[PDB]
Amino acid sequence: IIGGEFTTIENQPWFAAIYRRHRGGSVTYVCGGSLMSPCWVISATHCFIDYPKKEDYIVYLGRSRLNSNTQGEMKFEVENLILHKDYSADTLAHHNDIALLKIRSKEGRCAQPSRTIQTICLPSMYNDPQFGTSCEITGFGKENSTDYLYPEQLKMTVVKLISHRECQQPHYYGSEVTTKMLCAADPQWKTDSCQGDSGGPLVCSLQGRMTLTGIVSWGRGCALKDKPGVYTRVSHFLPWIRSHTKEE
C-alpha cells in the first residue's frame, strides 16, 4: 500500500494472508484474502497462476505481522483451490480476477470465527456506492512501485471511488476499464494500493455492515497522476461464488 496507517488484525479481522511453501522449509507471501464462510477464503486468480497447486499453499487467519507468528492465529490447508474459468489478462488489464480457496484445519475443521477470525458481508445484487464514497483497503503491500521489501506491519488506507465517465477517459485507461471492475484513487498521487496487495479488500460499509465491495487486481504503477486502481467488482460474481460454495 502507499496510504499511511500501520494497523492490525482487529481493524481488518476478515483479511487472510496467503502463503506458498517450498521443498526447502520456508514460505513467501503471495496475495491477500477475505473470509466468507468458515471454510472459504476468496482472492484473485492471477496469484495462483504460475504455481496452480492447491497442495503447496498454506493460509493464515488472525495474523497482523508478516514474517512472524501472531498468537491466536489459525493455519490452514487449502483443501480445494478452484479459480475462475474465464480469467484472462492483456497487456494492461485483468478480467475475472476472483478465486475461492476452501480451507480445512490441520486437525480437521473450518474457521472458528472469533475476535480476529471474522468474516465479511457480501454485497447484494447490482449494488455499489456512488462515485465519491471513500472505502478502505489494506494489505502487506509494496510501499513503493520501486521499493522491494513488503512492509513488516499490516497496512491500511482510505480511497475515493471513480466513475465510468471518469476512468474511461483518454488520459486514463480508455476502453481497458470494463463494467465488471471498479476504479479507485485519492485526489492525486498521494495514496493507492500496489503489488502484493492483490486478492484483498476494497472496503465500504453499506447500509450498516462493512461489505466486500471490491477486490484489488491491477493498475499501471502504484499511485499515479490520472491512474486509478482497479478492483474486481464482486457485484456481478455473486452467483458464481454461491454456485460453488454449496455442492460443485
Binding site: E10, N11, W14, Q118, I120, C121, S205, R209, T211
Partner: peptide, 8 residues
C-alpha cells in the same frame, strides 16, 4: 459478518 470488534 461486517462485525468489526472494538479495541480502542
Amino acid at each position: 459478518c461486517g462485525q468489526k470488534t472494538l479495541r480502542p
